[PDB]
Amino acid sequence: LYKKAGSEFALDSSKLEAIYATSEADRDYKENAVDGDENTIWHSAYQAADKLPVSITIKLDKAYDLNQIDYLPRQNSRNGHVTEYKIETSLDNENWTEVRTGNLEVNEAGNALANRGYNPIRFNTINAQYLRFTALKTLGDTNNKYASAAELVFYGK
Ligand SMILES: OC[C@H]1O[C@@H](O)[C@H](O)[C@@H](O)[C@H]1O
Ligand SMILES: [Ca+2]
């Protein structure tokens, strides 16, 4: 059911701009989520009072008919691995359509995602220039408090 990175429908990261996130920690800025770089991450704030849900909004250079994104978890640490998510899209960054929710498989020990690479998330084709990705449950030294993402990969035309 899933496309892979080499699909003709995979959008280049240059077509993406992170325009908002609930919070950002350290130098793990929102833009790091869509820079095509597996080594950089967006990470939400992780002070004692910080908690879920958190979200990040990606703006595309124009509207696309989207039907998949891949979530790439942090490569060097499980901190912020997203295990339950929501996807919303819009044409105007104001009026959102709820596209889907879902879960990502966790490893046996329950400390990291089972798939440490690109985790595909499919959905019925929807025309969108903005996508809001919300982390509802996450893993970490403390679970369910902060989220991270190394990449979000978009598929559409
Ligand atoms: O407490 C959460 C923090 O833990 C650190 O070990 C990590 O480098 C940070 O990115 C953040 O995840
Ligand atoms: Ca990155």
Q: Whose CA is nearest to atom 4 of ligand 1?
A: 79
Residue at 96: amino acid letter: W
CA distances from 39 to 35, 115, 130 (A): 10, 17, 24
CA angle 63, 116, 2 (to 5 degrees): 45
- Gyration radius of the chain over CA positions: 14
Q: How many domains does the chain have?
A: 1
- Taking residue 17's Cβ as centre, other Cβ atoms within 10 Å add up to 15
CA distances from 40 to 14, 31, 75, 82, 86 (A): 15, 9, 9, 16, 22
For ligand 1, mutation pick of 27, 29, 46, 47 (most atoms within 8 Å of CB)? 46
Residue numbers after which the chain breaks, C to N beyond 2.5 angstroms: none
Span from the CA of 79 to the centroid of ligand 1 (angstroms): 6
Taking every pair of C-alpha atoms in the chain, what is the biggest distance, in angstroms?
Answer: 43
We report the CATH number of the domain holding residue 11 as 2.60.120.260
Contacts (Cβ under 8 Å, ≥6 apart) of 93: 19, 57, 59, 129, 130
Q: Is 37 in the pocket of ligand 1 (CB under 6 A)?
A: no
Alpha carbons 137 and 107: distance in angstroms, whole number: 15
Alpha carbons 58 and 112: distance in angstroms, whole number: 25
Domain extent for 62: 1-157
